[PDB]
């Protein structure tokens, strides 16, 4: 845990997805938003496609690859990192490759055959998602489920609400660096944390 020297100023971002307050990821609002709806619906036409499935069948899958992932089936197409890969929860003769959204944050357990090669010219695009923390606040008993639903409807989680957010810590998780931000919706402004505290979710 640090403390940002020369923070900069404040931006709006969108919370594109949420695990708890200390790991949720943000979008930043601007034009590579729009270009990623652009991304979804041209992926979404190329894959939905089996003739382009099938020009894209994987034959070995890696931990760390950038692969091309349904949501949910019939549903929307989305570049996807294997972060790991296991046993079928329901049927171990089966594997799932646990894929994160690379340009949301979520995480989910695809059956691997589902997956395919992502076309390189797909990877142009800047990878959306950043991973932060809740700044200032911590779990009050590590976070109450009921507590992590709250912090979803204050932020509005993939719902493309704009929150204004401004970095006051970090933490170091090569390595990589997590901003701990405040988030501050504004209509006055209501202090994301600050709610979560006053409502005793957090300490």
């Known amino acids: 845990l640090y403390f940002q020297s020369n923070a900069g100023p404040s931006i709006e971002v969108y919370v594109s997805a949420v695990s708890s307050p200390s790991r949720f990821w943000v979008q930043f609002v601007g034009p590579q938003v729009a270009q990623l709806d652009d991304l979804v619906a041209h992926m979404t036409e190329y894959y939905s496609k089996k003739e382009n499935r099938e020009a894209h069948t994987l034959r070995h899958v890696s931990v760390g690859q950038v692969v091309a992932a349904v949501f949910r089936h019939d549903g929307r197409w989305y570049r996807a990192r294997v972060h790991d890969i296991r046993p079928n929860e329901f049927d171990s003769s089966q594997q799932v490759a646990d894929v994160f959204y690379l340009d949301y944050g979520d995480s989910e357990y695809v059956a691997t055959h589902e997956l395919c090669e992502l076309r390189a010219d797909l990877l142009r695009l800047r990878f959306q998602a950043m991973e932060c923390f809740l700044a200032g606040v911590r779990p009050a008993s590590k976070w109450h489920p009921q507590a992590v639903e709250r912090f ?49 979710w957090a300490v």
């Open 152 to 200: 979803e409807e204050l932020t509005q989680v993939a719902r493309w609400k704009a929150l204004v957010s401004r970095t006051c810590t970090y933490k170091k998780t090569k390595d990589k660096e997590i901003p701990g931000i405040k988030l501050f919706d504004v209509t006055g402004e209501l202090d994301v944390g600050a709610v979560l505290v006053a409502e005793g």
